[model samples]
Target: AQYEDGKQYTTLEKPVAGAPQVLEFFSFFCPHCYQFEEVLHISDNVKKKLPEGVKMTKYHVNFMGGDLGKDLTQAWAVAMALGVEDKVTVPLFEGVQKTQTIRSASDIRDVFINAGIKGEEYDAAWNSFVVKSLVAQQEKAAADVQLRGVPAMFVNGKYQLNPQGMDTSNMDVFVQQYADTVKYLSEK
Candidate 1:
């Protein structure tokens, strides 16, 4: 948790041999997050693009649907702690955007169960320090970073990806460009 502000980023809590830290701030419901997922998940290419020891933390926002969205945001924090985020996130995002519905917290818990992670484990991790800290820390991050939008990204705690900064016509190219930045920082 050393690398984490406990709110916004998960800094390489431990030095990954020698690699830069990459921070991604996102909400599960954001269309841009979906875009990132669509691009990054192709062949697990985005997951693969992250350099070794680089920690990726997602911060969920509730601004979309008020407290209900915040509750779903909490569900995401919990799911990530449970380690079945890989299973729950995509389906939930797809379910919500495509279906335009986010039913209940139990539904998210069910996603974890389907992924073979037990409910108790899911619950425990959800309430654990790491996740709570992530949520709290992200709350703080929103205040100081002057962040304006969803799916914002930062590198080595210095660089950023905001919707207006640059135009990336190709999803793959845009994704790789971000990946390459991590690669560049790691090698520096």
Candidate 2:
């Protein structure tokens, strides 16, 4: 099955030039994105399949939770800056999509705290210039993609995956197909 342009993926108007990379635009509040992490385990599986030197970068989209969207993005930025994304990503997803416990920035802070991140460190990172820049860059990338949905994946910052074009007959097939498609694109 050959992956064709405009079908399997779409090219960005202005592609980002860099190392082999996959830029994922997702929202913490998106149910499908939560399923991608917890149910399908797409991130982990895809990470293993990606070619060497290919990197996956996640951007928390800020268009889902209304006024709280920016806060959620900020929360993710803080987690990344603190090198605790492994600790906070799934919890944030569950808090927003499953538990309905995250309603504001304060609630997000609690997740970090529970992850053993000191409150002071969280505060510092949240306000730090790096985190702020990350958040802004994510916002810009989402906008540049003209993103209309969550759980969007772009390979090498050039080919944006067309989830609708992939085989999704079942969880296992979908995961494998998704990873294969990403691998194919990354090699390009």
Candidate 3:
């Protein structure tokens, strides 16, 4: 693939060290992000095809949902801390975007409870130092990037993919190209 810097991705000012890492900045309350995860399953497809040792990390942006935004970020941090992101991510998106079932932090906790995570365990992870630190990192990263969008993807912490540059004519084609772009950037 003949990828160009300005067209495919924009280089970061202060590049992060973790090469071969895909760091995603997203918000659970963002409708486009909800579709990107639940409908398009971009992360799942990209994960299956990424080059070996290329890691993917997701950060929940604390800029949406009015006063509930930071709380939602905390909820995602807790899920990450508990290693239950696979179980709770889609459900949280569904509740927030489709079902209108989640409105506040307590409601977010209920989704985990429904996912069979014990309430006490959830509470423990929610308050754990790891989770708090994760949330802080997420907030800091967002600010550092001066992010103003949802579902932003950065490859190797240096290249931010240009969503408009990809072919979105079909789901299969889009997923392939998306994964290919990440693979190309990871290998670079």
Maximum-lDDT candidate: 2
Show how many residue pairs clash in every candidate, following the order shown: 4, 0, 0
Model 2 agreement with the true structure over 1-188: per-residue lDDT tens digits: 47888877788888876623888888887888988888998888889998787777888887888878889999889988888989998888888888999888899999999999999999999999999898888888887768889888888768888878777778899888888988998888
Q: What digit string (tens of lDDT, one per residue) describes model 3 on residues 1-188?
A: 48988776789898876433788888888988987898889898889988777678889997788778888899989988889999999899888888998887899999999999999999999889998898988887777677889889888778898878877778788778877888888888
The superposed Cα distance between candidate 3 and the true structure at residue 124, in angstroms, equals 1.6
Q: For model 2, where is the 10-residue window of minimal lDDT?
A: 13-22
For all candidates in order, the CA lDDT equals: 0.61, 0.85, 0.85
Candidate 1 regions with alpha-carbon error over 4 angstroms: 1-20, 40-52, 124-131, 162-168, 185-188
Query: Which candidate would rank higher by TM-score, 1 or 2?
Result: 2
TM-score of each: 0.70, 0.93, 0.93
State the lDDT at 13 in candidate 1.
36
Sorted by TM-score (best first), the order is 3, 2, 1
Tens digit per residue, CA lDDT, model 1, 1-188: 31223232323333323212555666666887787775465224534766676666556676675665776767777766665667777777766676754567676666667777777888887678888786776666554455667776656655454334333677667566555544554444
Off by over 4 Å in 3: 18-20
User: What C-alpha lDDT, on a 0 to 100 scale, does residue 160 get in candidate 2?
Assistant: 84
Which order, best to worst by lDDT?
Answer: 2, 3, 1
